[PDB]
Amino acid sequence: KLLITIHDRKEFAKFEEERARAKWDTANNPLYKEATSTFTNITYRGT
C-alpha cells in the first residue's frame, strides 16, 4: 500500500511555497538598491 507513502511524500511538494512564505517571507523586500536600477555607468570616482 504505497499509494499512501507516495501520496504522502507529496506533502512536501507544495509545502515548498509555505517555507519560502513563512512569516515575513524571511525577506521584507530589503531592496538596498533596486529602485535606482541605474547603477551608473561604472563612472563612480569621487574627488
Binding site: 500500500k1 499509494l3 499512501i4 501520496h7 504522502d8
Partner: peptide
C-alpha cells in the same frame, strides 16, 4: 481511493472525488 478523498475533501465537502 484512500487519503486522496480523505485529505482534500474533508476541509470542504466530505464527498469522495468523482462527485467533488
Amino acid at each position: 481511493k484512500v487519503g486522496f478523498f480523505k485529505r482534500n475533501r474533508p476541509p470542504l465537502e466530505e464527498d469522495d472525488e468523482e462527485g467533488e
